[PDB]
Amino acid sequence: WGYGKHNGPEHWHKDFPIAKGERQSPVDIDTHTAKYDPSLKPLSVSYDQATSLRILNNGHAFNVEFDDSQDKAVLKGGPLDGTYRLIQFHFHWGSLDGQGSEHTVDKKKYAAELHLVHWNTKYGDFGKAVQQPDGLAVLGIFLKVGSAKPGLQKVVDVLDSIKTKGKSADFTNFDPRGLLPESLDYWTYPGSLTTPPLLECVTWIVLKEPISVSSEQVLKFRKLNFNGEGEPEELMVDNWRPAQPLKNRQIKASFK
Ligand SMILES: CN(Cc1ccccc1)C(=O)Nc1cccc(S(N)(=O)=O)c1
Numbered sequence: 001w002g003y004g005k006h007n008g009p010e011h012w013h014k015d016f017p018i019a020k021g022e023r024q025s026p027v028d029i030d031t032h033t034a035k036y037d038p039s040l041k042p043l044s045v046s047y048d049q050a051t052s053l054r055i056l057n058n059g060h061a062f063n064v065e066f067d068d069s070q071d072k073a074v075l076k077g078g079p080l081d082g083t084y085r086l087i088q089f090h091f092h093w094g095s096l097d098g099q100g101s102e103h104t105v106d107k108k109k110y111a112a113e114l115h116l117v118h119w120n121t122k123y124g125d126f127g128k129a130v131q132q133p134d135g136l137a138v139l140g141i142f143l144k145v146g147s148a149k150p151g152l153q154k155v156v157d158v159l160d161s162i163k164t165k166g167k168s169a170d171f172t173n174f175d176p177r178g179l180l181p182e183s184l185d186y187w188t189y190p191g192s193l194t195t196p197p198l199l200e201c202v203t204w205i206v207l208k209e210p211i212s213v214s215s216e217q218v219l220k221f222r223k224l225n226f227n228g229e230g231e232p233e234e235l236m237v238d239n240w241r242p243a244q245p246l247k248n249r250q251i252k253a254s255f256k
């Protein structure tokens with residue numbers, strides 16, 4: 001599977017029939033139909049003790065990986081019961097500024113989308129968590145092109161060292177708090193991984209406020225490669241799944 005004409009999202013259901021399931025992601029967030037839920041709690045993002053370790057080009061995106069062997073960087077509150085540990089973040093982005101996000105807002109596509117991936121500590125590790133309907137919490141943050149995001153620059157500047165699939169680099173002491181917008185207002189709904197195996201294990205928490213990144217920052221994302229070293233160059237762009245049917249789900253808003 002990938003994002004090309006012959007192996008992209010429209011083909012995934014052949015290997016992963018859950019692609020046509022009842023709680024697939026991403027979705028379009030219709031802002032007028034989302035309902036304010038006053039029982040939703042503020043999000044608690046506790047990233048002060050985060051320990052980043054490594055950055056990896058996995059052939060579909062790049063992951064910044066964290067030490068998740070202790071409760072060092074955790075997400076709690078909001079719609080969540082219990083404690084969810086940060087394991088990695090990554091992005092999805094476009095070939096052009098007019099596309100790239102997975103979720104859309106009133107059909108608007110952003111230039112990119114950041115996914116901060118967390119697993120429910122009651123399941124012991126990530127591999128067990130993805131087998132559970134409440135196993136993961138993914139915090140999604142839209143990126144628009146405008147001013148630079150200073151806290152993203154350290155990520156941008158290492159990408160030259162992980163150009164191709166399978167390359168990794170040490171990436172310690174990175175603070176993911178520098179990727180957050182000011183407001184933690186959010187929408188939430190039950191969904192899935194947006195990549196094969198498309199497991200229906202995610203509580204999605206999508207922030208209303210985008211972050212701004214510069215044109216030069218996103219252009220550096222677009223220099224990455226899907227291919228391995230010594231294979232024909234295929235730029236890593238348009239690594240996003242389009243919006244899927246909402247089916248029998250309601251999107252809830254934390255804000256009026
Ligand atoms: C493809 N693999 C490897 C993988 C292989 C087999 C089983 C489980 C996982 C992923 O882990 N993907 C992933 C993980 C978390 C979040 C998101 S996302 N984009 O929904 O935030 C995508």
Ligand SMILES: [Zn+2]
Pocket residue numbers: 090091092115194
């Ligand atoms: Zn993702």
